[PDB]
Design a protein around this nucleic acid. Structure first.
Length: 52
DNA sequence: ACAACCTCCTTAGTACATGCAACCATTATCACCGCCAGAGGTAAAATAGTCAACACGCACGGTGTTAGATATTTATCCCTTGCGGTGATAGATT
């Protein structure tokens, strides 16, 4: 996720899960961690917004 | 007084425009050598220091194990092909 340059979770909140399969060494387990570590904050994945 | 005129006198004022390629030498010529400057040298001590000793202490990298990812294999699914049936187009008219 450092190689994939996602240095603000403000965009990890809205990048598609298929669009994280865009740099190698990022496979079936790391792609699966995302699915609740964002929720653990009191947040979610999948939250596009009209101003950022 | 002078005036310019006849002749060949010499003087010397000019010689259109746009562009690209190349490289930068020849001279000889005693600078003497004497003096001494601050001024080169270096010994011994200021402005301060080396790196070897014995300690100190840490980082980094490679060997080992683990992790998980990925590219393969498999198999599923959809979007696409090509033909066909027959579509309301293109556009002439109302």
């Amino acid at each position: 996720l450092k190689a994939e340059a996602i240095h603000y979770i403000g965009d990890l909140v809205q990048r598609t899960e298929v669009e994280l399969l865009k740099t190698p060494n990022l496979g079936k387990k790391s792609l699966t961690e995302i699915k609740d570590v964002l929720a653990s904050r009191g947040l979610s994945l999948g939250m596009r917004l009209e101003n950022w």
